């Protein structure tokens, strides 16, 4: 999903 | 008082359902390390054991519901704007030429633990495309963050 998934892919900003 | 926007409470448990394939609230340490691989990076299998190990307070072997955001907690000290935006944008757009590619989420989302073809992503890209062009520009996906 383009709308909801944003919070899913954005959780990679801590370790990366 | 109880609800402001159903997306920030209902769709959050919709986001957890994206990683946790078992539905019990636990994912393999192989997946979480794959967060880098969405950026077209390297999988941190051994290092996420260094994070699963510390977050598995209820010791699931895997990871539980409450201790999930704690790994993000350490680095969650003052978030950036466009840097945090690109950490989802170039991470999402496999090409990045004003439009986002169709077969990208089947590439990325598959890497995020849900193995599917462009077909399943097509409904995922259609949501970003009101004109049904099968690809995502800066303006449509942008809208998705002002409304995550």
Curated annotation (Swiss-Prot), chain B:
The keyword Cell membrane does not apply. CDD domains: EFh. The modification N-acetylalanine is found at residue 1. The modification Phosphotyrosine is found at residues 99, 138. (Microbial infection) Inactivated by S.flexneri OspC1 and OspC3 proteins, which specifically bind the apo-form of calmodulin, thereby preventing calcium-binding and activity. Ca(2+) 1 binds at residues 20, 22, 24, 26, 31. Belongs to the calmodulin family. This is Calmodulin-1. It comes from Homo sapiens.
